[PDB]
Amino acid sequence: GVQVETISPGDGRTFPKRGQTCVVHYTGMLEDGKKFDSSRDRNKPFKFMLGKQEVIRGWEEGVAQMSVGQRAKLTISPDYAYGATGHPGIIPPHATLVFDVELLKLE
């Protein structure tokens, strides 16, 4: 149950592929409160791979669905985010996540 609301499309030819490593820079915000998951660029963005359940689903599917050079606003729901319940530290219970991601490159 994730949505992809693009703002600045990318070429529309290259995406993350099976056997690649995405190079993304995002900022995680919540419905209308604050940041819980940011990628404070300063110390290098975030980098992950497709098919090695290292990142939530909302991403995996979301980010995939995005193209090299595109930026979007994704909306993730419990089903994909972290399941149903989370932490009382970063992920309060049923607290939908919102990511504004920029897929930069593949490695």
Curated annotation (Swiss-Prot):
EC number(s) from the headed UniProt entry: 5.2.1.8
Localisation: Cytoplasm, Cytosol; Sarcoplasmic reticulum membrane
GO CC annotations, alphabetized: cytoplasm; cytoplasmic side of membrane; cytosol; membrane; ryanodine receptor complex; sarcoplasmic reticulum; sarcoplasmic reticulum membrane; terminal cisterna
Catalytic activities: [protein]-peptidylproline (omega=180) = [protein]-peptidylproline (omega=0)
Gene Ontology molecular function terms on file: activin receptor binding; calcium channel regulator activity; FK506 binding; I-SMAD binding; macrolide binding; peptidyl-prolyl cis-trans isomerase activity; signaling receptor inhibitor activity; transforming growth factor beta receptor binding
Modified residues (N6-succinyllysine): 52
Gene3D superfamilies: 3.10.50.40
Activity regulation, short description: Inhibited by both FK506 and rapamycin.
Record's keyword annotation contains Transmembrane helix: no
Membrane-related topology note: Peripheral membrane protein
PPIase FKBP-type domain segment(s): 19-107
Keywords assigned: Acetylation, Cytoplasm, Isomerase, Membrane, Rotamase, Sarcoplasmic reticulum
UniProt enzyme class: isomerase
Modified residues (N6-acetyllysine): 52
Any GO BP: regulation of amyloid precursor protein catabolic process
Family: Belongs to the FKBP-type PPIase family. FKBP1 subfamily.
Record's subunit section: Interacts with TGFBR1; prevents TGFBR1 phosphorylation by TGFBR2 and stabilizes it in the inactive conformation. Interacts with ACVR1B and SMAD7. Identified in a complex composed of RYR1, PDE4D, PKA, FKBP1A and protein phosphatase 1 (PP1). Interacts directly with RYR2 and RYR3. Interacts with GLMN; rapamycin and FK506 abolish the interaction with GLMN in a dose dependent manner. Interacts directly with RYR1.
Function per UniProt: Keeps in an inactive conformation TGFBR1, the TGF-beta type I serine/threonine kinase receptor, preventing TGF-beta receptor activation in absence of ligand. Recruits SMAD7 to ACVR1B which prevents the association of SMAD2 and SMAD3 with the activin receptor complex, thereby blocking the activin signal. May modulate the RYR1 calcium channel activity. PPIases accelerate the folding of proteins. It catalyzes the cis-trans isomerization of proline imidic peptide bonds in oligopeptides.
Protein name from the UniProt record: Peptidyl-prolyl cis-trans isomerase FKBP1A
Underlying gene: FKBP1A
